[PDB]
Design an enzyme around this catalytic site. Structure first.
Site, PDB file in Angstrom:
ATOM      1  N   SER A  38      -2.705 -98.359  20.232  1.00  0.00           N
ATOM      2  CA  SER A  38      -2.497 -99.216  21.093  1.00  0.00           C
ATOM      3  C   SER A  38      -1.106 -99.709  20.222  1.00  0.00           C
ATOM      4  CB  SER A  38      -2.910-100.029  20.958  1.00  0.00           C
ATOM      5  OG  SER A  38      -2.119-101.303  21.368  1.00  0.00           O
ATOM      6  N   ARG A  39       0.259 -99.252  19.773  1.00  0.00           N
ATOM      7  CA  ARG A  39       1.264 -98.839  18.638  1.00  0.00           C
ATOM      8  C   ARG A  39       1.255-100.994  18.389  1.00  0.00           C
ATOM      9  NH1 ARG A  39       1.444 -94.552  19.601  1.00  0.00           N
ATOM     10  NH2 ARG A  39       3.034 -93.238  20.133  1.00  0.00           N
ATOM     11  N   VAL A  40       1.235-102.175  19.023  1.00  0.00           N
ATOM     12  CA  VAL A  40       0.778-103.987  18.825  1.00  0.00           C
ATOM     13  C   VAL A  40       0.091-103.269  17.531  1.00  0.00           C
ATOM     14  CG1 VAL A  40       1.681-103.672  20.521  1.00  0.00           C
ATOM     15  CG2 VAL A  40      -0.390-103.802  20.554  1.00  0.00           C
ATOM     16  N   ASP A  74       3.629 -97.666  25.756  1.00  0.00           N
ATOM     17  CA  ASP A  74       3.456 -97.231  23.806  1.00  0.00           C
ATOM     18  C   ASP A  74       1.922 -96.971  23.759  1.00  0.00           C
ATOM     19  OD1 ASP A  74       5.548 -98.766  24.220  1.00  0.00           O
ATOM     20  OD2 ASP A  74       4.648-100.771  23.637  1.00  0.00           O
TER      21      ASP A  74
END
Ligand SMILES: Nc1ncnc2c1ncn2[C@@H]1O[C@H](COP(=O)(O)OP(=O)(O)OP(=O)(O)O)[C@@H](O)[C@H]1O
Ligand SMILES: [Mg+2]
Lengths: 53, 498, 62
Positions: B367-369, B342
């Protein structure tokens, strides 16, 4: 536990009891003699400096 | 006296049962790979055993012989030996019985301390959870590093990547993450407790011993497992250690608990796999790695899921550690694992020596989140900090007018704020306090070389006089208006008094 | 269970070892040499204090 994993349980028991009886000392206020300084200030800021001001 | 007695207790219970078992004769043993002849019903990637009690895995099923890889030393296997099939795919013990125990890649206790009381076993090669069990990443995984919790946040169920050169500070980030979880694990609620697993691949035993003693000093083995497949362990063990650790973490996530696993490194699992594959005679690929070198990792990092509340709700974060060569991120394994994971955390030596430690290159780290999996207070403050550093990085290469001069000043203040020491992770509310003080233009008066002082001092003040405010920020999980006004007065008072 | 002749044989050699352990039997000089080696290593690592009773401190005030 420490007494339960030692062959001479008596020696460690004696250590424990000597620990129980023996405490530690504490320092005092001799180094804090700066007590006196406060009284001197009570003259300047309230008797000499205050009155003259 | 009782030492011999407990020794006898071991004999008192033995393994009388001798069974009629299928076998095979070792046609040829050499370099750690045996070519057994027989074992007609041996499965694929089954666990077989040798005449000396030494294990192995049947990896190749050719028509005329079975290619077996030996999980251990190879000098003890002769030709014409005997290989008995155990009739069980490779599996490892799992359970809370493993916590605080150092174990090898196969789940054998490595630190003495007796055996593992595990009552269940799990297959290393299990398929990842489907598309339906998972649920988007919600909670935050508190790492303790300011620059990671603020600028590249990590959720629970995410698969971050720590990628850098040798000796930039990757294992340090891993250990800080492990140590930080102590505050949550000591508390009461079980929804925050995070059990940590550390897979040490190819690291010399001295390094793992240093690491284990460091965790013990910070009292962090209550909830840590250490799966060590060190350098002197046959390649079939360094290959399999990540999967063993991942099974030990799959047990946790499958039971509503949360786990953290840290492969360290995956670039050495790749090398062990390449050695195995080349000694089984499988044709090489690019840089001599087998063709199935992406699969190797993708099937392993895809097990770090976030189960929905129907499947327990448990999670399993993963922090693979890759090692690049002179920053050549464009290499083979680095790019594979970069396109598997990710987020990322780029550590750079030019930043390590320039004084920025941890070297996290906030410009490239992702950070994709992002938004999700961040506490509301951190979300409020780190956003403005991120914008300020983004603007600063554009106009940093040089060193006039008031506006841009103050922009550079703020950027530098924040930069010296983000620095940190080793094995001293900070609670999220403390990070929020420090970052708030830094980003609300308070430190712009101070010199930059002194910022660290302030930082340290400030905490040691707030940690004693204003415990109530930090408890408020933690419990309510946001900088409310009254909390903001307090923070304001505390910082204004402290700045002048210092 | 009374059949595994090796089982009872090991238990029997056990019982003999139990009775004969008045002093470490078949010790040889390696026994004493080792014992000394790691005793000295442990003593060095730990300390040289009065390894019997509690040594006293006698601190000094500020
Ligand atoms: N935040 C920090 N502050 C000060 N020093 C640090 C910090 N992080 C790492 N270091 C230093 O960097 C050195 C290497 O740390 P670390 O082992 O974490 O990096 P590494 O890349 O894992 O090393 P290797 O890859 O060779 O195992 C350590 O000796 C440590 O002193
Ligand atoms: Mg390291």
């Amino acid at each position: 536990y420490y007494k339960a994993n030692v062959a001479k349980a008596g020696l460690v028991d004696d250590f424990e009891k000597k620990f129980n009886a023996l405490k530690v000392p504490i320092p005092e206020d001799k180094y804090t003699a700066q007590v006196d300084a406060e009284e001197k200030e009570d003259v300047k800021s309230c008797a000499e400096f205050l009155t003259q001001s | 006296a009782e030492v011999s007695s407990i020794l006898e207790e071991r004999i008192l219970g033995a393994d009388t049962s001798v069974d009629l078992e299928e076998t095979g004769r070792v046609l040829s043993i050499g370099d750690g790979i045996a070519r057994v002849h027989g074992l007609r019903n041996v499965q694929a990637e089954e666990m077989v055993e040798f005449s000396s009690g030494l294990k192995g895995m049947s990896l190749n099923l050719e028509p005329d012989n079975v290619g077996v890889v030996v999980f251990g030393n190879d000098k003890l296997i002769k030709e014409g030996d005997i290989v008995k099939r155990t009739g069980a795919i490779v599996d490892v013990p799992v359970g809370e019985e493993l916590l605080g125990r150092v174990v090898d890649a196969l789940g054998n206790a490595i630190d003495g301390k007796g055996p593992i009381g595990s009552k269940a076993r799990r297959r290393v090669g299990l398929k990842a959870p489907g598309i339906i069990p998972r649920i988007s990443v919600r909670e935050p995984m508190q790492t303790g590093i300011k620059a990671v919790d603020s600028l590249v946040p990590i959720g629970r169920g995410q698969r971050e990547l720590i990628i850098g050169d040798r000796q930039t500070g990757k294992t340090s980030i891993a250990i800080d993450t492990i140590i930080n979880q102590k505050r949550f694990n000591d508390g009461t609620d079980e929804k925050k407790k995070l059990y940590c697993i550390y897979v040490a691949i190819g690291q010399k035993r001295s390094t793992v011993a240093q690491l284990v003693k460091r965790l013990t000093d910070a009292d962090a083995m209550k909830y840590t497992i250490v799966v060590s497949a060190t350098a002197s362990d046959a390649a079939p063990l360094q290959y399999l250690a990540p999967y063993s650790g991942c099974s030990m973490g799959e047990y946790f996530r499958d039971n509503g608990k949360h786990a953290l696993i840290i492969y360290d490194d995956l670039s050495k699992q790749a090398v062990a796999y390449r050695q195995m594959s080349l000694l089984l005679r499988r044709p090489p690929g690019r840089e001599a790695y087998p063709g199935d070198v992406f699969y190797l990792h993708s099937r392993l990092l895809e097990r770090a899921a976030k189960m929905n509340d129907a499947f327990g709700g448990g999670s399993l974060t993963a922090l693979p550690v890759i090692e690049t060569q002179a920053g050549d991120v464009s290499a083979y394994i680095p790019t594979n694992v970069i396109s598997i994971t990710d987020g990322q955390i780029f550590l750079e030596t030019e930043l390590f020596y320039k004084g920025i430690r941890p070297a996290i290159n906030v410009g490239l780290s992702v950070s994709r989140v992002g938004s999700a999996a961040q506490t509301r207070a951190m979300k409020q403050v780190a956003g403005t900090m991120k914008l300020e550093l983004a603007q600063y990085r554009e106009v940093a290469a040089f060193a006039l007018d008031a506006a841009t001069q103050q922009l550079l000043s703020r950027g530098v203040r924040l930069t010296e704020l983000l620095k940190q020491g080793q094995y001293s992770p900070m609670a999220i509310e403390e990070q929020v306090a420090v970052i708030y003080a830094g980003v609300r233009g308070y430190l712009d008066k101070l010199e930059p070389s002194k910022i660290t002082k302030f930082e340290n001092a400030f905490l040691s003040h707030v940690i004693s006089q204003h415990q109530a405010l930090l408890g408020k920020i933690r419990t309510d999980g946001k900088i409310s208006e009254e909390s903001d006004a307090k923070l304001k007065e505390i910082v204004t008072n402290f700045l002048a008094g210092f | 269970d009374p059949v595994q002749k090796l089982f009872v044989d090991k238990i029997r050699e056990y019982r003999t070892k139990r009775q004969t352990s008045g002093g470490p039997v078949d010790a040889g000089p390696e026994y004493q040499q080792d014992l000394d080696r790691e005793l000295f290593k442990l003593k060095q690592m730990y300390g040289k204090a009065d390894m019997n009773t509690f040594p006293n401190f006698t601190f000094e005030d500020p």
